[PDB]
Design a protein around this ligand. Structure first.
Ligand SMILES: *Cc1cc2c(cc1C)nc1c(=O)[nH]c(=O)nc-1n2C[C@H](O)[C@H](O)[C@H](O)COP(=O)(O)OP(=O)(O)OC[C@H]1O[C@@H](n2cnc3c(N)ncnc32)[C@H](O)[C@@H]1O
Ligand SMILES: *Cc1cc2c(cc1C)nc1c(=O)[nH]c(=O)nc-1n2C[C@H](O)[C@H](O)[C@H](O)COP(=O)(O)OP(=O)(O)OC[C@H]1O[C@@H](n2cnc3c(N)ncnc32)[C@H](O)[C@@H]1O
Lengths: 573, 573, 52, 104
């Protein structure tokens, strides 16, 4: 028996833990997955010297923990099998595909992660804010009020994630790309560092933030926190929240201890579900909210009708450019090169402090040193130059998020053929109109791996504004990217699998009124009608957004925690 | 200051840890890599509930901690860049490639793994014995003495790993293939289960063994071993052992803390290198031993001449089958079938204990139930049914190791497409004659990610019996696999990139006499000339072997440990 | 190349490949309809696809 | 060097070439349609024996060349189709459409 129980040890799971644990509460937290990250629980897996030296190898780790949400029944024709081999006469349901799934209105890319820390053990760490136009109202009819609230809550999230914008100032390649872009857009567009949840430590190590940054996930009391009380129980599939008859209260959490196998009922005052857009939705439907099964309007549920509807996922376009000759030459514009590299007459010099220099002394000193010390190498960019983290944020006139940078690179010859210093990644993130017809539902007969109803997608991108904007977005990535250089073959402008972006929201969305705003939680993140049941995560966000949701989910989480603090006494220690 | 220092925390470094920490010594172990396998330090990463319910997905974890040993300069012509993108006029050194490496005399598949637990945090766990023909001699002129000594070491080594031959005995697939191959070779070849470092926990969970199994890596003293003394220091790149001018002794170990940055000088009575076959060599070469640089039979080295010569790696052919129609019908050969699937009158029945049944009662009960509870499924094999683990061990009438099984493979297009249960993997491992001209050397110019001399390989498969055998092996896989099914399109008979198999041996090889057996360590695994320097790993094996080596490398390490407990005294508690 | 120039397939089943990376402004059917001449009588699994 | 090994197939009534009474091809004729699978039994056995033979035989001249590993080819690509208007002495007893004069 605890004051609060948290389902899920992700970054939002951990926002709720951080706030409540240090506010004197006794918190129990369960996660389906295990401690998967060394001695800092929930930590980013990319924080090891091996990876920061071999960053390309990291894409593999991501794919290791992205388990597909809904896979249609495969109908590929393999007809070169030996005549002695067994072949079915049908494409039967096999290797776990979901026979409810329409292969053509799916979010095939959608995946999930089961590991203490959630997808924060692997994430890229982009933590920007939403402007008014992507933002749910926390207050109605007082923009200034609303802005006050969001700034206060955002600033705390930024605090928790260790967000900053300075970690990459001393990269050449970063500065090359940011300056070129500013030049060009001549005050139509602000360019800047992607805000990133991380702290730098040497020129070659960054500590990427995570669930663990928010909250270190040690059992308490411990020596450093002898007054706090917290327990984390991994290897537990939470399955059901038990409803009172009045549908005013949750009375327990039914759990499955995957190690022992046995099941348990856990009692608490406050119930917080932070298990992710898909699984926050799945547990509530398994618990009698919403509607189990293929959705049926001639029989609409009376509890939380809007749940699992209005689901938004972002369109996502990608490509990679090989930096322009013009920009490589520009790097070395202050240098006075003579001789031919590798010969003994050869010298590169610059006049330090010179007011006619285009770059500062630090830059030029690196370019000189690299070129004199490595005459064999033909590019003026030093060897461990940090990589770019450029962005232009969402605006009315360009309603999409943009990251011009380097993440998860899976090397297929023409990306090892090209020198990686030349390569910059473009990803542009469109926004989607929340629409009732787009659903996440659960099968009343099919089950997934952990024995729960199988999730199923009825999603297509709304025609109209989302469709228009999404193709405008592509052409923009092509217009913008051309300025830094040509596409790198094997990474041509493309739209990515729907859902691969993993920015799903609106599955348990927020509003002021359940009915008029078609939603399941209030701006306190409480479920309508229920006194002690809160939801955390992107499931909450009701609006059309292009930017990365986590820092807004955490914002709403922090807001919810404050309701809790104002209405439930911690038990006495 | 310590009694013993171990470099590396692989299964073998742990073999030394377990014997020496147990015996009473004050032991320090370093690993360049960090703790990330969650709370059981160094445990096998496949031992989560998720990965055991998602085997397919583990391939990625393995991919992500195999950092290639030596990558040659890329000469792929990309002639489709935009004209505005920068491109050089030469194939210069880039993306960390190694200029010394002849691409055609390489072991391109070779890779190494820097994470506490070593490669044992991802290995398949096959732990067979070597028969006399692949084994090094431990007693001369006394083949029964030499048989006893090994039976004794291997029995001890099996204990440490929990090696077993019956963890899969209730797999329907395992026995179907095991039996079919037995019928087929009818007194020509013996088949049995792969021996496997693994403990079954539930019908659906195997607890795979690892370095963790051998030693729990938990600092000591603790509650459970309060009179023991052990410390594991991760993130520590050991750069060099230090010789006396006599070359009779090692005086200290120079280390480099990758968190602090700082370097130190550790002292110990005993030094044990278990940093791997590639890196045991590197360290040594970097510490005076053997030659540095492109090797040069003109100027030959005064210390351990033979180090980094007579290197062996196995030829590996691979392919997958789709189970035959006959074999699949046989699974359900005992059943009476009435009606047609999915009808209210559909029956599947067998008669328990009927003298004319072909399968035991347990197998039939599984078949019957599965056919009744999943009437939409066209196959008689139950879903959660463990995979085959079938082997016919190396004999001289078939001089290779064989694995008819299922192991982390990245199933592509025809391979989520063919039903998992129909699929079997085939891996045949050839034995390579040790030859002087086959080398692992180290650049005097280039350097790896850790500023150690860069590994460069000079390897080709000996002509003669290593090559004749290799092809007779490819042919054998074809002849034999043709008895379980045809080839899986997408996984056709093929030789794998050299070294991919990761069984490299003989880089620091054992023999009785240094010059006569052209070797680097005697049969206590102590380096010739040196009074306190020991070496463990597959690199110790000097012979031509096809079976998986780690159990034999352990076995030798136990023996080295006996020497240690018999010539060095623990300092006191 | 010349061979393939004059091997016109006898019976091509209705294609059911899933291309799901199309732009949201592009037309997509909600079915795998009979298109580019495939033979909707053809069982993709008891065909002689190679026959030409 | 190229290896191609060509198995033989038991003629079986159930394997058909038929034409659609509603669908039409490019030259406005009924659309051909296949109901073919390789007969289990002797054809299936022989066909996989054949593969293993190509592997045994080919090994003698040398190893496979990657991108051209032992494989079964698309059914029908071999273009050796027969029996569609087959021959016999008697239409009825030999199940056929032409005589040994090739007359219908
Ligand atoms: C995969 C990915 C993520 C991603 C990204 C990079 C990639 C490759 N880039 C991002 C970036 O630049 N910035 C950004 O804002 N987001 C980025 N993301 C996605 C980001 O990780 C998510 O937006 C966010 O992490 C979601 O966190 P949340 O706190 O909502 O939860 P979660 O991370 O999915 O983890 C919660 C967990 O709860 C568990 N679980 C699920 N079901 C159960 C049940 N039934 N019982 C108990 N526990 C449950 C999980 O195992 C889990 O870890
Ligand atoms: C990769 C792999 C391994 C493998 C396998 C399948 C895969 C994909 N299947 C096998 C099988 O089923 N059975 C078997 O016999 N072996 C199989 N293997 C290979 C096996 O894992 C290895 O042979 C075995 O792990 C070798 O043990 P050892 O302990 O000798 O070496 P290691 O595992 O490579 O670990 C050594 C480590 O020390 C480190 N290191 C490297 N440099 C340094 C320096 N400079 N200083 C300190 N430590 C260093 C590493 O970081 C490492 O972990």
């Amino acid at each position: 028996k605890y004051d609060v129980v948290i389902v899920g040890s992700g970054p939002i799971g951990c926002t709720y833990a951080r706030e409540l644990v240090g506010a004197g509460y006794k918190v129990a937290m369960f996660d389906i997955g295990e401690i998967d990250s060394g001695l800092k629980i929930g930590a980013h897996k990319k924080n090891t010297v091996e990876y920061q030296k071999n960053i390309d190898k990291f894409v593999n780790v991501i794919q290791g923990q992205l388990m597909s949400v809904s896979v249609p029944v495969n109908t590929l024709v393999v007809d070169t099998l030996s005549p002695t081999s067994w072949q079915a006469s049908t494409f039967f349901v096999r290797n776990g595909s979901n026979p409810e799934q329409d292969p053509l209105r799916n979010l095939s890319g959608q995946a999930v992660t089961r590991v203490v820390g959630g997808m924060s053990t692997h994430w890229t760490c982009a933590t920007p804010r939403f402007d008014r136009e992507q933002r749910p109202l926390l207050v109605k009819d007082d923009a200034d009020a609303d802005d006050a609230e969001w700034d206060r809550l955002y600033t705390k999230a930024e605090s928790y994630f260790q967000t900053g914008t300075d970690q990459f100032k001393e990269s050449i390649r970063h500065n090359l790309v940011l300056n070129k872009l500013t030049e060009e857009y001549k005050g139509q567009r602000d360019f800047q560092q992607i805000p990133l949840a991380a702290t730098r430590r040497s020129p070659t190590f960054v500590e990427w933030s995570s669930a663990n940054t928010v909250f270190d996930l040690q059992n308490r009391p411990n020596t450093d926190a002898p007054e706090e009380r917290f327990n984390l129980f991994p290897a537990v599939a939470c399955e059901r929240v038990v409803r009172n008859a009045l549908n005013s209260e949750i009375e327990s959490l039914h759990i499955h201890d995957l190690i022992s196998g046995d099941r348990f009922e856990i009692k608490a005052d406050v119930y917080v579900l932070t298990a992710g857009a898909v699984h926050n939705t799945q547990l509530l439907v398994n618990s009698g909210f919403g509607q189990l099964g293929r959705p049926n309007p001639a029989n609409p549920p009376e509890l939380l009708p809007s749940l699992g509807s209005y689901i938004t996922e972002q369109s996502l376009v990608f490509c990679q450019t090989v930096m322009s000759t013009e920009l490589i030459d520009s790097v070395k514009s202050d240098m006075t090169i003579r001789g031919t590299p590798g010969e003994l007459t050869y010298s590169v010099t610059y006049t330090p402090g010179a007011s006619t220099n285009k770059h500062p002394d630090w830059w030029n000193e690196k370019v000189k040193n690299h070129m004199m010390q490595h005459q064999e190498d033909p590019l003026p960019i030093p060897f461990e130059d940090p990589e770019p983290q450029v962005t232009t944020l969402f605006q009315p006139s360009h309603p999409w998020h943009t990251q011009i940078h380097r993440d998860a690179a899976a090397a297929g010859a023409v990306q090892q053929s090209i020198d990686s210093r030349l390569i910059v990644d473009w990803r542009f993130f469109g926004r989607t109109e929340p629409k009732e017809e787009n659903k996440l539902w659960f099968s009343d007969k099919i089950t997934d791996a952990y024995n729960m109803p199988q999730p199923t997608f009825d999603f297509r991108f709304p025609a109209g504004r989302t469709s228009k904007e999404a193709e405008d977005m592509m052409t923009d990535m092509c217009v913008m990217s051309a300025k830094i250089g040509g596409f790198l073959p094997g990474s041509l402008p493309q739209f990515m699998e729907p859902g691969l972006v993993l920015h799903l929201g609106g599955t348990h969305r927020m509003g002021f009124d359940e009915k008029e705003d078609n939603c399941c939680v209030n701006t306190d993140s409480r479920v309508f009608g229920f006194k002690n049941l809160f939801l955390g995560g992107c499931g909450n966000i009701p609006t059309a957004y292009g930017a990365n949701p986590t820092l807004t989910a955490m914002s709403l989480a922090i807001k919810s925690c404050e309701y809790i603090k104002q209405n439930f006494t911690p038990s006495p220690f």
